[PDB]
Design a protein around this nucleic acid. Sequence first.
RNA 1: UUACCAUCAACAUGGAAACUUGGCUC
RNA 2: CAAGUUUCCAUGUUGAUGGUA
Length: 755
Amino acid sequence: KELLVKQGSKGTPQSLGLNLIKIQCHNEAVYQYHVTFSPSVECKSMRFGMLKDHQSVTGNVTAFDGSILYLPVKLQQVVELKSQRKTDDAEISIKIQLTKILEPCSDLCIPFYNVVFRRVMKLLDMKLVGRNFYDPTSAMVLQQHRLQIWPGYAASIRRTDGGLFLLADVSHKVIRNDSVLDVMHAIYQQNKEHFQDECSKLLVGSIVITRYNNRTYRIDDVDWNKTPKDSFVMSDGKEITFLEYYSKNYGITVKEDDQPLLIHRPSERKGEILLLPELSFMTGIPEKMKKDFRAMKDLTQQINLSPKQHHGALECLLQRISQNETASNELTRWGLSLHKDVHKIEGRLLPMERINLRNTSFVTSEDLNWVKEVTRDASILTIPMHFWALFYPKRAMDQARELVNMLEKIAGPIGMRISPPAWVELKDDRIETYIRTIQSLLGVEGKIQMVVCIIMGTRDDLYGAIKKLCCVQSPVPSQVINVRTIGQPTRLRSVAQKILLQMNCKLGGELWGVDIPLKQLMVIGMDVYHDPSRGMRSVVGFVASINLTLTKWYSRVVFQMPHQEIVDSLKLCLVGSLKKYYEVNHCLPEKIVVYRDGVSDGQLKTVANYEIPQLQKCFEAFDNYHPKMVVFVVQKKISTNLYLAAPDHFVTPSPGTVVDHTITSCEWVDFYLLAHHVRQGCGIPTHYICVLNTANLSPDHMQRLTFKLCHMYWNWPGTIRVPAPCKYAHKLAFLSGQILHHEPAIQLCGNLFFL
RNA sequence: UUACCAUCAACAUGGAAACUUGGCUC
RNA sequence: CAAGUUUCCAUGUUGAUGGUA
Ligand SMILES: [Mg+2]
């Protein structure tokens, strides 16, 4: 790990709000023991309790996470200890053998610095659910929602270039007080004779949380013929009944025994697991609650928190940490002095770039909104459409007359050669004839057109068949519209005119440019759209800049082969992108900037060594063509929050800032660029990690190049979460992997259909 | 599948730490 | 070397409503 200077010079500094820890390193050695509880107890409760029962041998300074104990003082090689169970009087044989001597400056200390913090905030009467800690003392209970929300904290200790830190997100968790058992009782009261089908309809596909070990478990089946009075064989090879299993591990004596059982079947590899309804609770958000205007406006008025409400909750967490003595000793025996106040990050607002139109050229303001700049002038990079087929079934005539009769009105300020659509009716929406109509006609409209498949209600098979026929068998676009979305005239201005230009974008109509000071720049946003829940061939979305001023982009999907992890596609995808580049610009690039998507933090090493070296060795297809490459990894689901520290309060700004110190990764070169256009909530910043940077790019150069790449997507008046090719490839990869399950047609490749 | 933007929920994948089991060779 | 368990984490995707629209 080299000492790399990351801070830039050009920009206006800011102030942020989430570091929360600075510790001094003092302990010369920490001693790790792995403990085998013989016989096996599985719950954390006894594994804490009988370890706390023997502080004469272990000591008061303890850190145990279920199987691993940590000490500051070395014992002998193996210590053997006898314990007796509080319920069945078992012969529990604790064996502690020292396995690791943790150095003060080793990255392996992060697990036990994290479990000591979990043991710290388990003393504040804070519960564990899933991964996080949630507070039951500031809940909101919603009776008509049948719901309860907890304002907990997802807190995690991690190492950073600015030392040790603890990142805490104010994570509100929804918990249903209704279990699966009580909602089974409610459905059985609602339907005494016909409840098994409702249980098999609202139970499979639904996912429960069990709180005896807080595990989240996917329901695959529910069985009524088997009760926990029947026994089974657990991991030690000896038969146990489930009630004695409860009394020996979790200690939670059940209230009834005539309840059914739930079957969970894991993925292929195998151990089928059985869960009681009483100890298992719902996912607490009802979609049957949701279908009204009063759901979020009465629930998430507090859950969609302000930045100041985040800072108040986090300062309340710090206050209850500091004012609790028993939590303070559990930090200060190990010598981990938490900071009693927040620790703040500096900022950097970049010199904001220029958006070049056909004639005008704006300096981008602080608001990033040019919503009604559309319908101004005719665009050069457009094929002027004339005719397109519009279909509607036998229930929604005037509903179609909501849309199209307004749409010719926004041909007013443009004044292009427009004509009314082919109003072709439908006799029956029952699966068939909707396939037959479109490729029965395919007529005068089919030059540059727009397929509008309008379906009453939510039906997956209908739109799947329509999009499969209307994007596989013929060169033709398609667009699914549900009548439930357009069912009211109130949602017309926001549904028909400003948006639903998917079809006008699918024929390739776009222009605006951002200035780039470099020469011969090829930027290429590789994305990987994975669908392993369906367990079939993952999809690569390939998009590259095939020109100089970045106005045109490439598109490619190739299905992978199952049981073959090595990518056979990306060489062909780069071959196609380079062939399109040599067909359009008639030249070869000098630098390549790749924005790879979708890897974990432990996976970049693979991207450092198992894929990008294959990209460098892929260039054998062209003679003496081995130039410099730049690789980046984009990240979305981030837990770091950003607030500007105005001298009165905290407000998350508009996108544009740069955070590059004391939040990054310890090994690679990272930065964070905020991309939420914040109207409410806290703006998560996009995380960009580089892998190979041999083009000698300064940090401000690649940060401003990333924001420039964020500036060039034809879908919005305001900036985007991930830059433009990683949303192009997202849209085309999702479309070509989940809906038609096929490659896009070659005959549409001159358009930018990824919009 | 209509512009992105939160939040909620869910699934799946990957890295590290050791433990246990199994596998041709001492 | 492979598989499983427990800890730490990390990562995308999907579905849903509230907002500028
Ligand atoms: Mg993606």
